[PDB]
Design a protein around this nucleic acid. Structure first.
Ligand SMILES: [Mn+2]
Length: 275
DNA sequence: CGACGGATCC
DNA sequence: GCTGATGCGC
DNA sequence: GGATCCGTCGGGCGCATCAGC
Protein backbone atom coordinates (compact mmCIF):
# COMPACT_ATOMS: atom_id res chain seq x y z
CA UNK A 1 0.00 0.00 0.00
CA UNK A 2 1.12 3.63 -0.26
CA UNK A 3 2.73 5.70 2.51
CA UNK A 4 2.46 9.42 3.30
CA UNK A 5 4.95 10.55 5.95
CA UNK A 6 3.15 12.56 8.67
CA UNK A 7 3.79 16.33 8.86
CA UNK A 8 7.03 17.43 10.58
CA UNK A 9 6.68 17.66 14.37
CA UNK A 10 9.28 20.37 15.20
CA UNK A 11 8.26 20.61 18.90
CA UNK A 12 9.32 18.21 21.75
CA UNK A 13 6.58 16.49 23.92
CA UNK A 14 7.54 19.01 26.67
CA UNK A 15 6.91 21.90 24.24
CA UNK A 16 10.56 22.73 23.46
CA UNK A 17 11.36 23.79 19.82
CA UNK A 18 13.73 21.71 17.63
CA UNK A 19 17.25 23.24 17.53
CA UNK A 20 18.97 20.49 15.52
CA UNK A 21 18.05 18.93 12.19
CA UNK A 22 20.11 15.94 10.94
CA UNK A 23 19.57 14.31 7.53
CA UNK A 24 20.97 10.85 6.54
CA UNK A 25 21.04 9.52 2.99
CA UNK A 26 22.47 6.45 1.23
CA UNK A 27 23.12 8.27 -2.11
CA UNK A 28 24.09 5.12 -4.13
CA UNK A 29 26.96 6.98 -5.82
CA UNK A 30 27.70 10.59 -4.72
CA UNK A 31 28.69 11.65 -8.28
CA UNK A 32 25.52 10.13 -9.81
CA UNK A 33 23.36 11.49 -6.98
CA UNK A 34 24.65 15.08 -7.65
CA UNK A 35 23.87 14.78 -11.41
CA UNK A 36 20.38 13.64 -10.26
CA UNK A 37 19.92 16.94 -8.26
CA UNK A 38 20.48 15.43 -4.77
CA UNK A 39 22.19 18.61 -3.50
CA UNK A 40 19.16 20.65 -4.65
CA UNK A 41 17.00 18.51 -2.32
CA UNK A 42 19.60 18.89 0.51
CA UNK A 43 19.48 22.72 0.12
CA UNK A 44 15.64 22.65 0.44
CA UNK A 45 15.96 20.36 3.56
CA UNK A 46 18.47 22.84 5.08
CA UNK A 47 19.81 20.35 7.73
CA UNK A 48 22.39 21.41 10.36
CA UNK A 49 24.17 18.06 9.69
CA UNK A 50 24.14 15.80 6.59
CA UNK A 51 25.37 12.16 6.75
CA UNK A 52 25.93 10.29 3.48
CA UNK A 53 26.52 6.59 2.77
CA UNK A 54 27.65 4.74 -0.41
CA UNK A 55 29.52 7.81 -1.69
CA UNK A 56 31.56 5.45 -3.97
CA UNK A 57 33.96 8.43 -4.31
CA UNK A 58 37.42 9.36 -2.93
CA UNK A 59 37.72 12.93 -1.52
CA UNK A 60 39.90 14.07 -4.48
CA UNK A 61 37.00 13.28 -6.87
CA UNK A 62 34.21 15.04 -4.95
CA UNK A 63 32.22 17.35 -7.28
CA UNK A 64 32.94 21.12 -6.78
CA UNK A 65 29.28 21.80 -5.96
CA UNK A 66 30.02 20.23 -2.53
CA UNK A 67 32.40 23.19 -1.89
CA UNK A 68 29.47 25.60 -2.54
CA UNK A 69 27.52 24.58 0.62
CA UNK A 70 28.08 27.45 3.13
CA UNK A 71 25.53 26.04 5.62
CA UNK A 72 27.41 22.69 5.57
CA UNK A 73 31.05 23.93 5.33
CA UNK A 74 32.64 21.42 7.73
CA UNK A 75 33.03 18.21 5.66
CA UNK A 76 34.64 14.87 6.62
CA UNK A 77 35.01 11.98 4.17
CA UNK A 78 36.06 8.31 4.50
CA UNK A 79 36.37 5.84 1.57
CA UNK A 80 37.94 2.35 1.49
CA UNK A 81 41.60 2.63 0.45
CA UNK A 82 41.58 -0.76 -1.34
CA UNK A 83 37.92 -0.91 -2.57
CA UNK A 84 37.77 2.03 -5.04
CA UNK A 85 34.16 2.67 -6.16
CA UNK A 86 32.50 0.97 -3.17
CA UNK A 87 31.23 2.01 0.29
CA UNK A 88 32.36 5.44 1.44
CA UNK A 89 30.73 7.70 4.02
CA UNK A 90 30.59 11.45 4.59
CA UNK A 91 29.51 13.88 7.33
CA UNK A 92 28.82 17.58 6.59
CA UNK A 93 28.09 20.09 9.37
CA UNK A 94 27.14 23.76 9.81
CA UNK A 95 29.31 24.00 12.95
CA UNK A 96 32.67 22.28 13.42
CA UNK A 97 32.58 19.13 15.56
CA UNK A 98 34.94 19.05 18.59
CA UNK A 99 36.36 15.71 17.40
CA UNK A 100 36.12 13.58 14.21
CA UNK A 101 37.30 9.95 13.95
CA UNK A 102 36.95 7.15 11.37
CA UNK A 103 36.42 3.40 11.76
CA UNK A 104 35.41 1.27 14.76
CA UNK A 105 38.82 1.06 16.42
CA UNK A 106 39.74 -2.38 15.18
CA UNK A 107 38.63 -3.52 11.73
CA UNK A 108 40.81 -5.44 9.26
CA UNK A 109 41.63 -0.51 8.30
CA UNK A 110 40.28 2.05 5.81
CA UNK A 111 36.82 0.38 5.28
CA UNK A 112 35.02 3.73 4.62
CA UNK A 113 31.95 2.76 6.66
CA UNK A 114 31.96 4.73 9.96
CA UNK A 115 32.40 8.40 10.94
CA UNK A 116 32.24 9.50 14.62
CA UNK A 117 31.75 13.22 15.30
CA UNK A 118 31.66 14.63 18.86
CA UNK A 119 29.58 17.76 19.37
CA UNK A 120 28.96 19.79 22.60
CA UNK A 121 25.93 17.82 23.85
CA UNK A 122 26.11 14.58 21.84
CA UNK A 123 28.24 12.15 19.80
CA UNK A 124 27.05 11.46 16.26
CA UNK A 125 28.03 8.23 14.48
CA UNK A 126 27.08 7.58 10.83
CA UNK A 127 27.46 4.10 9.38
CA UNK A 128 27.15 2.10 6.17
CA UNK A 129 26.79 -1.40 7.70
CA UNK A 130 28.30 -4.21 5.47
CA UNK A 131 25.67 -6.10 3.46
CA UNK A 132 25.38 -9.92 3.84
CA UNK A 133 25.42 -10.14 0.04
CA UNK A 134 23.58 -12.14 -2.60
CA UNK A 135 23.41 -15.80 -1.46
CA UNK A 136 24.45 -14.60 2.07
CA UNK A 137 28.20 -15.01 1.16
CA UNK A 138 29.24 -12.23 3.65
CA UNK A 139 26.70 -13.06 6.40
CA UNK A 140 29.31 -14.38 8.91
CA UNK A 141 31.48 -11.31 8.15
CA UNK A 142 28.41 -9.13 8.89
CA UNK A 143 27.78 -11.01 12.18
CA UNK A 144 31.41 -10.40 13.27
CA UNK A 145 31.17 -6.71 12.25
CA UNK A 146 27.84 -6.29 14.12
CA UNK A 147 29.50 -7.56 17.34
CA UNK A 148 32.58 -5.34 16.87
CA UNK A 149 30.37 -2.29 16.16
CA UNK A 150 28.11 -3.01 19.21
CA UNK A 151 31.23 -3.19 21.42
CA UNK A 152 32.75 0.00 19.89
CA UNK A 153 29.49 1.94 20.41
CA UNK A 154 29.06 0.70 24.00
CA UNK A 155 32.73 1.39 24.81
CA UNK A 156 32.65 5.02 23.70
CA UNK A 157 34.44 6.89 26.62
CA UNK A 158 32.43 10.12 26.25
CA UNK A 159 29.54 10.13 28.73
CA UNK A 160 27.67 12.15 26.10
CA UNK A 161 24.35 10.83 24.61
CA UNK A 162 24.71 8.98 21.29
CA UNK A 163 22.94 9.45 17.96
CA UNK A 164 23.64 6.58 15.48
CA UNK A 165 22.35 7.20 11.93
CA UNK A 166 22.68 5.65 8.48
CA UNK A 167 22.13 2.48 6.48
CA UNK A 168 22.15 -0.28 9.12
CA UNK A 169 21.39 -2.78 6.29
CA UNK A 170 18.60 -4.59 8.21
CA UNK A 171 14.81 -4.36 8.40
CA UNK A 172 14.39 -5.08 12.14
CA UNK A 173 10.82 -6.45 12.12
CA UNK A 174 8.19 -7.69 9.61
CA UNK A 175 6.65 -4.16 9.73
CA UNK A 176 10.01 -2.85 8.30
CA UNK A 177 9.53 -4.47 4.82
CA UNK A 178 6.67 -5.20 2.36
CA UNK A 179 7.57 -8.89 1.79
CA UNK A 180 8.76 -10.32 5.16
CA UNK A 181 7.96 -14.02 4.43
CA UNK A 182 9.83 -14.16 1.08
CA UNK A 183 12.93 -12.34 2.43
CA UNK A 184 13.86 -14.37 5.57
CA UNK A 185 16.83 -15.95 3.70
CA UNK A 186 17.70 -12.70 1.87
CA UNK A 187 20.30 -10.14 3.01
CA UNK A 188 18.71 -7.54 5.33
CA UNK A 189 16.04 -9.83 6.86
CA UNK A 190 17.99 -12.90 8.03
CA UNK A 191 17.27 -13.90 11.70
CA UNK A 192 21.04 -13.32 12.26
CA UNK A 193 20.90 -9.65 11.11
CA UNK A 194 17.57 -9.01 12.96
CA UNK A 195 19.08 -10.52 16.15
CA UNK A 196 22.17 -8.31 15.68
CA UNK A 197 19.91 -5.23 15.49
CA UNK A 198 18.09 -6.25 18.69
CA UNK A 199 21.45 -6.89 20.40
CA UNK A 200 22.63 -3.41 19.27
CA UNK A 201 19.53 -1.75 20.83
CA UNK A 202 19.93 -3.63 24.16
CA UNK A 203 23.76 -3.44 24.48
CA UNK A 204 24.61 0.27 23.83
CA UNK A 205 21.65 0.79 24.65
CA UNK A 206 19.72 2.54 21.79
CA UNK A 207 16.09 3.34 20.79
CA UNK A 208 14.62 3.41 17.22
CA UNK A 209 13.44 7.07 16.85
CA UNK A 210 10.91 6.35 14.06
CA UNK A 211 9.42 3.21 15.74
CA UNK A 212 9.34 4.98 19.14
CA UNK A 213 7.09 7.66 17.59
CA UNK A 214 5.26 5.37 15.10
CA UNK A 215 5.25 1.87 16.66
CA UNK A 216 2.44 0.43 14.53
CA UNK A 217 3.00 2.39 11.28
CA UNK A 218 3.37 -0.01 8.26
CA UNK A 219 4.49 0.68 4.64
CA UNK A 220 7.19 3.14 5.86
CA UNK A 221 10.36 2.32 3.91
CA UNK A 222 13.71 3.99 3.06
CA UNK A 223 14.83 1.59 0.27
CA UNK A 224 13.28 0.10 -2.91
CA UNK A 225 15.16 -2.04 -5.47
CA UNK A 226 15.66 -0.16 -8.76
CA UNK A 227 14.29 -3.37 -10.35
CA UNK A 228 10.65 -4.33 -11.12
CA UNK A 229 9.30 -0.76 -10.47
CA UNK A 230 9.43 -1.53 -6.71
CA UNK A 231 9.45 2.20 -5.70
CA UNK A 232 6.25 3.04 -7.67
CA UNK A 233 4.57 0.02 -5.98
CA UNK A 234 6.05 0.95 -2.52
CA UNK A 235 7.61 -2.55 -2.27
CA UNK A 236 10.44 -1.53 0.01
CA UNK A 237 12.52 -1.90 3.17
CA UNK A 238 13.34 0.35 6.17
CA UNK A 239 17.17 0.01 6.34
CA UNK A 240 17.94 3.64 7.33
CA UNK A 241 17.53 4.74 10.94
CA UNK A 242 18.23 7.28 13.67
CA UNK A 243 18.96 5.33 16.88
CA UNK A 244 19.21 7.39 20.09
CA UNK A 245 20.37 7.05 23.68
CA UNK A 246 17.40 6.92 26.17
CA UNK A 247 18.53 10.35 27.61
CA UNK A 248 17.69 11.95 24.19
CA UNK A 249 14.04 10.72 23.93
CA UNK A 250 12.63 13.92 25.70
CA UNK A 251 14.58 15.89 23.05
CA UNK A 252 13.02 13.84 20.20
CA UNK A 253 10.64 15.98 18.14
CA UNK A 254 10.35 13.74 15.04
CA UNK A 255 12.01 11.12 12.76
CA UNK A 256 11.02 11.59 9.13
CA UNK A 257 11.13 9.42 5.97
CA UNK A 258 11.51 11.67 2.85
CA UNK A 259 9.76 9.20 0.49
CA UNK A 260 9.51 11.58 -2.50
CA UNK A 261 13.19 12.63 -2.60
CA UNK A 262 14.89 11.04 -5.64
CA UNK A 263 18.56 10.45 -6.62
CA UNK A 264 19.12 6.97 -5.13
CA UNK A 265 17.45 3.59 -4.39
CA UNK A 266 17.33 4.88 -0.81
CA UNK A 267 15.29 7.83 0.32
CA UNK A 268 16.69 10.27 2.94
CA UNK A 269 15.69 10.24 6.65
CA UNK A 270 15.55 13.39 8.86
CA UNK A 271 15.77 13.79 12.67
CA UNK A 272 14.58 16.85 14.66
CA UNK A 273 16.06 17.25 18.19
CA UNK A 274 15.34 19.97 20.82
CA UNK A 275 18.77 20.39 22.48
C1' DC B 1 14.91 -9.46 -4.45
C1' DG B 2 10.37 -9.26 -6.64
C1' DA B 3 7.97 -12.05 -10.05
C1' DC B 4 6.42 -16.34 -10.82
C1' DG B 5 5.73 -21.38 -11.16
C1' DG B 6 4.68 -25.19 -8.70
C1' DA B 7 3.70 -27.63 -4.33
C1' DT B 8 0.97 -27.91 0.04
C1' DC B 9 -2.63 -26.91 3.29
C1' DC B 10 -6.95 -27.04 5.05
C1' DG C 1 38.99 11.65 -24.41
C1' DC C 2 34.92 9.14 -25.19
C1' DT C 3 31.83 5.18 -25.73
C1' DG C 4 30.33 0.68 -24.85
C1' DA C 5 31.30 -4.15 -22.90
C1' DT C 6 32.31 -6.64 -18.90
C1' DG C 7 32.81 -7.45 -13.88
C1' DC C 8 31.39 -6.58 -9.24
C1' DG C 9 28.27 -5.43 -5.65
C1' DC C 10 23.77 -4.99 -4.29
C1' DG D 1 -9.78 -24.50 -4.79
C1' DG D 2 -8.33 -20.15 -2.65
C1' DA D 3 -4.58 -19.10 0.33
C1' DT D 4 -0.19 -19.79 1.59
C1' DC D 5 4.47 -21.53 1.16
C1' DC D 6 8.86 -21.98 -0.93
C1' DG D 7 12.35 -22.48 -4.36
C1' DT D 8 14.11 -20.51 -8.72
C1' DC D 9 15.34 -16.89 -12.09
C1' DG D 10 16.31 -12.45 -14.59
C1' DG D 11 17.14 -8.10 -14.10
C1' DG D 12 18.26 -1.71 -12.57
C1' DC D 13 21.75 0.97 -11.28
C1' DG D 14 26.68 2.93 -10.15
C1' DC D 15 31.49 2.60 -10.68
C1' DA D 16 36.17 0.33 -12.26
C1' DT D 17 38.67 -1.53 -15.90
C1' DC D 18 39.57 -2.37 -20.58
C1' DA D 19 39.46 -2.23 -25.77
C1' DG D 20 38.97 0.29 -29.68
C1' DC D 21 39.69 4.36 -32.15
MN1 LIG E 1 23.20 0.32 -2.44
Amino acid sequence: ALYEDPPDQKTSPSGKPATLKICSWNVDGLRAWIKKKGLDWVKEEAPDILCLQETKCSENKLPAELQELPGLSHQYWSAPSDKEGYSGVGLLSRQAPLKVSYGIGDEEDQEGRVIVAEFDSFVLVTAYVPAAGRGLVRLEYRQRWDEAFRKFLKGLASRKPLVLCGDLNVAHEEIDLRNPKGNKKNAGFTPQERQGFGELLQAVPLADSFRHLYPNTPYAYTFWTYMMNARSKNVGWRLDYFLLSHSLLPALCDSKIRSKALGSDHCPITLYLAL
